[PDB]
Design a protein around this nucleic acid. Structure first.
Length: 45
DNA sequence: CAATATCCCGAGTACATGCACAGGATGTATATATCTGACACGTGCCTGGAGACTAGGGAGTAATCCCCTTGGCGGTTAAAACGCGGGGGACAGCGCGTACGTGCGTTTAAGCGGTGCTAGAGCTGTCTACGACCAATTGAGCGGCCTCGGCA
């Protein structure tokens, strides 16, 4: 009936005290600024 | 002496208190723990002692009238007591906050290595501030010149 029930653990706060569902957008972006971008590349920031 | 008042004693009066009860949360109890700091050891400083001397101050006195102190002052209200007004006092209910419980997830503490901020260094090296002295100013009091009011 329903599409699925054995849903995967994508990243929620089961394993520790950290923020509940997932990182906020600012924290995501702080991890995107680490990548090997080059001077012509489109981006979100 | 009369009068308003405080004091005192017994009847009658709700509930307050001290108690008994169920039960729950925490104080105990044991074992373990490192580490606070106790204790022991010297380090080196100032707290103290101890002298010589001036000059600042302190103590003393003398003279005295300022200020306090007192009496007697004249003037007006806080108190006394009453009349007199409204206002502090005793019940019915709403629902809003406070509490309290749930699951909310933010941040701190800790232990990590790196490093630059600060706080003890100088004779730093001077020179603001510290006396030292001079000079200006105002004010006050004392002489001295000059119109006029009461007296011969």
């Amino acid at each position: 009936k329903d599409p699925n029930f054995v849903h995967s653990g994508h990243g929620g706060a089961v394993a520790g005290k950290k923020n509940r569902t997932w990182k906020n957008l600012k924290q995501i972006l702080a991890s995107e600024r680490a990548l090997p971008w080059q001077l012509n590349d489109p981006n979100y920031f």
